[PDB]
Amino acid sequence: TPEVGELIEKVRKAHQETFPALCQLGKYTTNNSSEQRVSLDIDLWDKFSELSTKCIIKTVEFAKQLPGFTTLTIADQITLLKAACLDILILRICTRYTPEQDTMTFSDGLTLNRTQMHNAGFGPLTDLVFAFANQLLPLEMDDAETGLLSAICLICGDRQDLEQPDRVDMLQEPLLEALKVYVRKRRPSRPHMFPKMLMKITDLRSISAKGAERVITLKME
Amino acid sequence: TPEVGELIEKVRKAHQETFPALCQLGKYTTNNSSEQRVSLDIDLWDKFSELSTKCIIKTVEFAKQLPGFTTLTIADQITLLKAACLDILILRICTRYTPEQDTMTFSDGLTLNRTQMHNAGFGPLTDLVFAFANQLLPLEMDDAETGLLSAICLICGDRQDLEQPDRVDMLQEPLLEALKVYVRKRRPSRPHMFPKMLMKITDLRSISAKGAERVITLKME
Amino acid sequence: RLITLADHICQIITQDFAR
Amino acid sequence: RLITLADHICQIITQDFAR
Ligand SMILES: CC1(C)CC=C(C#Cc2ccccc2)c2cc(/C=C/c3ccc(C(=O)O)cc3)ccc21
Numbered sequence: 001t002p003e004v005g006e007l008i009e010k011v012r013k014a015h016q017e018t019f020p021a022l023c024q025l026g027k028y029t030t031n032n033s034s035e036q037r038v039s040l041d042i043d044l045w046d047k048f049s050e051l052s053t054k055c056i057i058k059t060v061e062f063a064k065q066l067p068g069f070t071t072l073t074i075a076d077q078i079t080l081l082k083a084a085c086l087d088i089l090i091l092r093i094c095t096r097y098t099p100e101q102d103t104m105t106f107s108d109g110l111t112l113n114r115t116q117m118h119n120a121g122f123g124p125l126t127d128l129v130f131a132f133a134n135q136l137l138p139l140e141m142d143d144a145e146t147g148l149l150s151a152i153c154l155i156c157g158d159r160q161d162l163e164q165p166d167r168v169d170m171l172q173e174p175l176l177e178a179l180k181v182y183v184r185k186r187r188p189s190r191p192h193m194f195p196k197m198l199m200k201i202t203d204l205r206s207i208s209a210k211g212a213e214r215v216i217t218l219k220m221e
Numbered sequence: 222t223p224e225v226g227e228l229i230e231k232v233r234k235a236h237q238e239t240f241p242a243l244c245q246l247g248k249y250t251t252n253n254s255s256e257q258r259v260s261l262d263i264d265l266w267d268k269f270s271e272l273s274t275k276c277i278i279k280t281v282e283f284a285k286q287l288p289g290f291t292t293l294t295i296a297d298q299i300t301l302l303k304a305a306c307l308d309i310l311i312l313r314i315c316t317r318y319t320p321e322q323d324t325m326t327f328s329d330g331l332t333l334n335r336t337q338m339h340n341a342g343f344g345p346l347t348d349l350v351f352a353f354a355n356q357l358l359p360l361e362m363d364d365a366e367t368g369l370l371s372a373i374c375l376i377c378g379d380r381q382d383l384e385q386p387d388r389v390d391m392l393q394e395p396l397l398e399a400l401k402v403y404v405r406k407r408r409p410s411r412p413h414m415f416p417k418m419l420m421k422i423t424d425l426r427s428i429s430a431k432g433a434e435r436v437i438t439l440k441m442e
Numbered sequence: 443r444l445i446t447l448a449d450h451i452c453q454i455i456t457q458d459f460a461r
Numbered sequence: 462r463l464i465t466l467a468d469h470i471c472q473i474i475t476q477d478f479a480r
């Protein structure tokens with residue numbers, strides 16, 4: 001528990017310093033491309049691409065703050081981040097869902113409704129992502145739990161092409177105990193909350209597997 | 222015939238000065254977004270938007286060079302141009318079709334294959350426009366005939382909301398005579414060429430009617 | 443921003459006749 | 462230009478670790 005307490009602290013902090021809370025942000029909206037669903041709006045896609053790229057970098061930063069991550073080979077670090085980054089992006093944006101307005105909020109405060117999220121880049125996966133966001137709400141996750149869940153998703157010894165899968169498994173072990181203990185101590189009345197949280201990684205995977213193979217359009221630089 | 226000769230000359234020149242011949246252009250290609258069809262490529266759409274806007278302005282300029290056009294009210298001029306501009310754009314790009322490479326060439330020389338044209342902005346109408354381009358080939362149209370057909374499509378007394386529909390009809394009459402006489406003189410062996418050419422306006426309308434209704438995305442702007 | 447092609451075409455032409 | 466989302470993500474990450 002002293003070493004478990006300090007792990008939870010390190011992971012909570014890693015998440016918080018790389019992902020602002022909704023309450024810490026100045027939410028702002030736009031009327032751009034709200035009228036109907038279209039294949040893509042170029043202005044929203046430009047912003048969405050920019051914000052997504054920034055969040056990928058912030059997720060890399062998050063990973064580097066996780067105990068032991070930078071002791072892995074650079075090859076294994078990149079391999080883990082390739083495999084889990086989109087899953088973590090999906091979890092992150094879904095934690096900024098506001099059910100009353102059916103909106104999601106990016107890390108600069110930009111706040112878009114469902115149709116705008118469709119036109120910004122969710123496209124045919126829009127309702128899937130929003131269903132996932134809604135299914136998160138009953139869990140009532142805090143920063144520590146979001147961060148530990150992200151960490152468990154990332155630090156996975158079963159990713160193909162790992163050079164040192166045993167070492168990765170070693171790093172995952174304490175994160176699992178950390179989440180298990182934390183969830184138990186946070187809500188002792190609800191004993192299935194731990195496995196329910198873990199199984200959300202499967203839902204993330206259903207979406208990211210579809211998303212990763214989509215051919216996207218970008219500027220030629 | 223001299224009054225007819227004068228009109229054909231004026232209309233040929235109007236077209237030529239607002240629309241370069243394929244042979245007058247430096248054709249250049251690109252490998253961008255050639256791999257597969259996608260809903261939109263942002264680089265190609267940016268270029269396509271830019272080029273189309275310029276061609277709209279050149280088509281306006283073309284109209285102003287047609288005898289009598291600027292004697293119509295500004296309202297009627299805008300009404301005629303709103304109704305026919307896309308039809309003229311379609312005919313124009315299709316006259317720059319190269320059958321051996323299955324490409325179209327814009328007025329700066331940009332030369333794109335069928336997949337690239339799809340991704341630039343043709344979208345679900347790509348095959349329809351290319352079918353029309355291919356159907357033009359047997360007609361073997363020259364500049365005077367392309368210009369006269371454009372003029373006939375534009376100067377139409379049956380457009381909704383004309384203030385002086387009689388005066389528009391008056392301007393169209395000599396264009397019809399001009400095309401009829403010119404086509405007859407050019408190919409005395411092929412007597413149905415005139416009505417065959419005229420009926421191509423119907424085909425332009427099938428395409429433009431679908432195109433006009435499309436919700437497009439633009440920079441704000 | 444979204445706009446029908448017809449409305450965009452109308453905008454380009456109307457602005458060109460502006461004086 | 463066209464790229465799979467997976468390949469794009471991989472590029473962003475790889476470039477970030479570059480020395
Ligand atoms: C799988 C799907 C539907 C398909 C495609 C996506 C994409 C992308 C992309 C495009 C360009 C470059 C890199 C990635 C995508 C992205 C996300 C989450 C994004 C995100 C953005 C900002 C923040 C923030 O500011 O806090 C948090 C999360 C969720 C689902 C998708």
Ligand SMILES: CC1(C)CC=C(C#Cc2ccccc2)c2cc(/C=C/c3ccc(C(=O)O)cc3)ccc21
Pocket residue numbers: 269270271272273274276277307310311313314326327328329342343344346347350428429432433447450451
């Ligand atoms: C009906 C369809 C398939 C749907 C949509 C279109 C569009 C558009 C748009 C987009 C932004 C601004 C204005 C218009 C469009 C455009 C054209 C012909 C275009 C043109 C471009 C350059 C040149 C030149 O350089 O010589 C000649 C012809 C044909 C079919 C379409």
